[PDB]
Chain length 385, copies 2
């Protein structure tokens, strides 16, 4: 029992196998060396471990290891890719197009670039979170140098057609960046086919450790960015600093694991997700945010009408979930939900350790909770005539 | 025996206690929560651990927890403090003063600011590595907004009078940043007294894990910087991104340990360092780069004259050390050493697990190895008339 964790999108637990691998690269009896120490064995062994992990990450997304730049997380990756490309190609233009539902790491980076003189078009998504590709194309100009649209949304799990957006960008000579923190290891990614130029990844959203991530930077056709972190020109000049070996080994192991169990795990999560939805879609006034069909298999975001969101989370004390509110979720607001519905919205994000028992328990707890509140709810009183 | 590790300045092993604390914040059965998840217990517990570590770090350096900003390492801390303060106060001036012997994270950051329109004065150190404060003083102008001089040099261990430098800066209203990555936990630091406004710290140089660090940002008199990492306004708007709890717990425990054992360990290292130098200082043409009495108690950088540096490292294969070459060390070159002598220089850095047994073995190996090299050395032949 205990507080059931259904907030995997916020962060996931490190896989035991990842944890045990990481432990081998920390203490004095392990490979604790600095890979930058080129004159001795401690460094050589550390460097080898990094290369193995860099290849493991690359294998998952069908990339060349040299295209993988290590960062401290997907936030830095997002900052590096957008600020990096925006600054590098600014002579070609200063227009950037993105989406209003992007993660803050993308939105706040674009806001900073706006104060630096760049122009940013924040596209509004359709009611279901999907970006109208026609509007995207209409927004593109001769001075547009970059587009950033995420693969899977962290709040509602909607999936964008990154392959198609990439096509549109390559044809116009526009750099395309994808924040794939919520899709890597869940949805198939093959950059040998995909026309994406920059792609952000993280470790802790796929059972790896927090504080590590990577940025895919296409080698062919060659894409370039200005490093945002200086001090040695590490990572082929794109990101300076000491390589956190144990963190890097953990991310690699996490990505090796994902490649192998992805197919079976995702089909499993999709089943638990539908199970959850089927068990509550019948509740009087409930709305699903996104698309329980093409969206991510592990995310379920639903709004419960005629209930004070302020007390919803308290009602669901037995569940560790999220509402998105910081002010209500800006993603839900971008979808068109009013402040009240947005507040009384819950995101259920499933993971590797979620079971049917938990789901059925959750289904029950939700129906009952929504039932009680609605009884002693002045708002619901209003609904029923 | 095996390759004796005398490269503690490049990186240190994670202390066993640090490693065991970290392991409790990774897997499903431990505190794996995202501290940013404010609606449930997994988040709350993680937040508590972070706050505990933030205090442990602040206590070592005499700061307030609120002045500690978490970063991915000292490289990022250096980037954040300098780019952050430069951009924030640019309307008051764009002149920055630093030292030619600073770590690359400071130098390459200053180089980037230069192409962005900032003016940087790189002061040359004295023969012994000390910055002549009168020269620093003469370089300060009314439009000088920032100074960055490190506490302990990573290559030669020389110590700068940061207290006096801080006084000079505060009196002129200049922001003073100190890269204290090699001094924290080794030399006493009390920010409640020290007139330093920004200070960089790392974890893996003081037996903590790689990939984690912090930036001290003075609260009173209030100092401010522009964030370089966007996405949520975390760390009081100064550094966005997920807080890597297991990493932060580790740095905290590492700083807790350093506060407790600093006095006893530093005296021990000073003894071993002195033991090493005494055993080789009598070798024909050997020179100590830095200062034997005031320099850091764990770093010994020596040059061996009239000997090809190319064979030096190999000859000392039984030791894991560094020559600081990339091209010879730029620090040594800044001290006035010719390219050849700089190349034939070795940096010995000691730590928590170094023993007198290792030092004595090192002494013998150095003497014998240097004698053998000089036996067949064309350079030595020239010298011997
Ligand atoms: C979590 C997340 C990020 C930020 O990840 P980092 O590793 O945590 O800092 C960025 N984008 C998306 C879509 C995310 O879910
Ligand atoms: C190692 C070091 C740095 C960089 O440290 P990070 O944790 O490794 O990236 C900066 N300054 C000094 C003086 C150092 O010794």
């Amino acid at each position: 029992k205990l507080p059931i964790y259904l907030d995997y999108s916020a962060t996931t637990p490190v896989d035991p196998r990842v944890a045990e691998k990481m432990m081998q690269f920390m203490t004095m009896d392990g490979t604790f060396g600095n890979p930058a120490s080129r004159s001795h064995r401690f460094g050589w062994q550390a460097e080898e471990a990094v290369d193995i992990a860099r290849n493991q990450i690359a294998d998952l997304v069908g990339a060349d290891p040299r295209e993988i730049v290590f960062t401290s997380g997907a936030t830095e990756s997002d900052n590096l890719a957008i600020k990096g490309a925006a600054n590098f190609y600014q002579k070609k233009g200063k227009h950037i197009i993105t989406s209003k539902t992007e993660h803050k790491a993308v939105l706040d980076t674009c806001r900073q670039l706006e104060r630096e003189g760049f122009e940013v078009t924040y596209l509004a998504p359709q009611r279901n979170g999907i970006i109208d590709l026609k509007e995207l194309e209409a927004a593109m100009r001769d001075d547009t140098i970059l587009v950033s649209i995420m693969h899977v949304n962290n709040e509602i799990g909607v999936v964008q057609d990154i392959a198609a957006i990439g096509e549109m960008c390559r044809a116009r000579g526009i750099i395309y960046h994808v924040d794939a923190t919520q899709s890597v290891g869940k949805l198939p990614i093959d950059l040998s086919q995909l026309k994406v130029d920059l792609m952000s990844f993280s470790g802790h959203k796929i059972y790896g450790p927090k504080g590590i991530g990577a940025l895919y930077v296409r080698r062919k056709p060659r894409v370039r960015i200005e490093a945002q972190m200086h001090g040695g020109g590490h990572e082929r000049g794109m990101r300076s600093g000491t390589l956190p070996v144990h963190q890097i080994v953990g991310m690699g192991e996490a990505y090796r694991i994902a490649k192998e169990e992805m197919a079976t795990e995702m089909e499993r999560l999709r089943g638990l997700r539908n199970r959850l939805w089927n068990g509550i879609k019948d509740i009087e006034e409930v709305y699903l945010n996104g698309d329980l069909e093409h969206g991510a298999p592990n995310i379920l975001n639903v709004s419960f009408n005629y209930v004070e969101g302020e007390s919803l989370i308290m009602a669901l004390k037995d569940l560790a979930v999220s509402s998105g509110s910081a002010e209500p979720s800006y993603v839900l607001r971008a979808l068109g939900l009013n402040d009240e519905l947005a507040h009384s919205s819950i995101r259920f994000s499933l993971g590797r350790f979620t079971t049917e028992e938990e789901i059925d328990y959750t289904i029950e707890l939700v129906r009952k909770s929504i039932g009680r509140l609605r009884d002693l709810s002045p708002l619901w009183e209003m609904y029923k005539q």
